[PDB]
Design an enzyme around this catalytic site. Structure first.
Site, mmCIF file in Angstrom:
data_model
loop_
_atom_site.group_PDB
_atom_site.id
_atom_site.type_symbol
_atom_site.label_atom_id
_atom_site.label_comp_id
_atom_site.label_asym_id
_atom_site.label_seq_id
_atom_site.Cartn_x
_atom_site.Cartn_y
_atom_site.Cartn_z
ATOM 1 N N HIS A 85 0.863 -1.181 0.000
ATOM 2 C CA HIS A 85 0.000 0.000 0.000
ATOM 3 C C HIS A 85 0.897 1.226 0.000
ATOM 4 C CE1 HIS A 85 0.142 -0.513 4.438
ATOM 5 N NE2 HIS A 85 -0.078 0.787 4.495
ATOM 6 N N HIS A 87 1.572 3.814 2.121
ATOM 7 C CA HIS A 87 2.217 4.480 3.245
ATOM 8 C C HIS A 87 3.731 4.285 3.224
ATOM 9 C CE1 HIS A 87 -1.842 4.528 5.595
ATOM 10 N NE2 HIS A 87 -1.711 5.602 4.845
ATOM 11 N N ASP A 89 5.817 3.132 5.343
ATOM 12 C CA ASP A 89 6.360 1.843 5.781
ATOM 13 C C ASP A 89 6.344 0.780 4.679
ATOM 14 O OD1 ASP A 89 3.501 2.098 6.400
ATOM 15 O OD2 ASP A 89 3.598 0.251 7.547
ATOM 16 N N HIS A 150 -7.157 -1.572 6.208
ATOM 17 C CA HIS A 150 -6.263 -0.564 6.763
ATOM 18 C C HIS A 150 -6.128 0.627 5.819
ATOM 19 C CE1 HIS A 150 -2.574 1.156 8.324
ATOM 20 N NE2 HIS A 150 -2.194 1.155 7.065
ATOM 21 N N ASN A 181 -2.789 2.558 13.079
ATOM 22 C CA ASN A 181 -2.993 3.866 12.458
ATOM 23 C C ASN A 181 -4.158 3.774 11.482
ATOM 24 O OD1 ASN A 181 -2.780 6.416 11.303
ATOM 25 N ND2 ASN A 181 -0.537 6.444 11.572
#
Ligand SMILES: C[C@@H](c1cccc2c(-c3ccc(CS(C)(=O)=O)c(Cl)c3)c(C(=O)O)[nH]c12)n1cc(CCCN)nn1
Ligand SMILES: [Zn+2]
Ligand SMILES: [Zn+2]
Length: 232
Positions: A85, A87, A89, A150, A181
């Site tokens: 995804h 983000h 990280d 998420h 998050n």
């Protein structure tokens, strides 16, 4: 010394590998975000005499350290990477990978979201994943889009040779008490998306969350439970 490494055991900037199965490793790194330190996982899958990387190590310097750790511990070249995804990280470090000769891939949705967010952008689009329940083969893995959880773009990865399910950030570890998050999450749809994972990969033997300790299939139900409780 053999246990799965934890956040207090990895200084920011170092990367550790953990053997999950024959030709399957996770990578663990730590990073600071908004004044707190968090661990994060990714995956490495042997692809003949090459390696497929799933997710960066959350930052340029961490991802350089990841490549150095792979060279030390495995010694096969990383030729392709998939980010699950948008983000940091998952994509932070894509520029390091691209400069190291790694071909970087993500769904068109992830690429658009990363670009809009100001994150690093994988080079190649993964088509065939835009509808929930979609799956495509990519080297030694299957990529699966379970639906929004998420994030709206989150992908999960299955290694059929080892029955390893890498849930990414759509799946939480058993010790989790909250949905992590949730800024970009869909709490209402997340349980349905987890149910799609459960139905598609009933033979999974190891389940790896995006952050924290691997376990078995129970991580999926636990995730649904914590997300439902959070949404309430
Ligand atoms: C870069 C990313 C990000 C940053 C910092 C922490 C996390 C966590 C997380 C993961 C686990 C826990 C513990 S637990 C399950 O709660 O017990 C917590 Cl507390 C948190 C997750 C995750 O859950 O995947 N991701 C994280 N990140 C940034 C953004 C929005 C940026 C907008 N400017 N969204 N995610
Ligand atoms: Zn995320
Ligand atoms: Zn995450």
């Amino acid at each position: 010394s053999g246990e799965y490494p934890t956040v207090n055991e990895i200084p920011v900037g170092e990367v550790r590998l953990y053997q999950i199965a024959d030709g399957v490793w996770s990578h663990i790194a730590t990073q600071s975000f908004d004044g707190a330190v968090y661990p994060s996982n990714g995956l490495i899958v042997r692809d003949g005499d090459e390696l497929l990387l799933i997710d960066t190590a959350w930052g340029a310097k961490n991802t350089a350290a990841l490549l150095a750790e792979i060279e030390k511990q495995i010694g096969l070249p990383v030729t392709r990477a998939v980010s699950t995804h948008f983000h940091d990280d998952r994509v932070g470090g894509v520029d390091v990978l691209r400069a190291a000769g790694v071909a970087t891939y993500a769904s068109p949705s992830t690429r658009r979201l990363a670009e809009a967010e100001g994150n690093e952008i994988p080079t190649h689009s993964l088509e065939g994943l835009s509808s929930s329940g979609d799956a495509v083969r990519f080297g030694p893995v299957e990529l699966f889009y379970p639906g929004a959880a998420h994030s709206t773009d989150n992908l999960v990865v299955y290694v059929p040779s080892a029955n390893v399910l890498y849930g990414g950030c759509a799946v939480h570890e058993l010790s989790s008490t909250s949905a992590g998050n949730v800024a970009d999450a869909d709490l209402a749809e997340w349980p349905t998306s987890v149910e799609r994972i459960q139905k598609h990969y009933p033979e999974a033997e190891v389940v790896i969350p995006g952050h924290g300790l691997p376990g078995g299939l129970d991580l999926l139900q636990h995730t649904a439970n914590v997300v439902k409780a959070h949404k309430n």
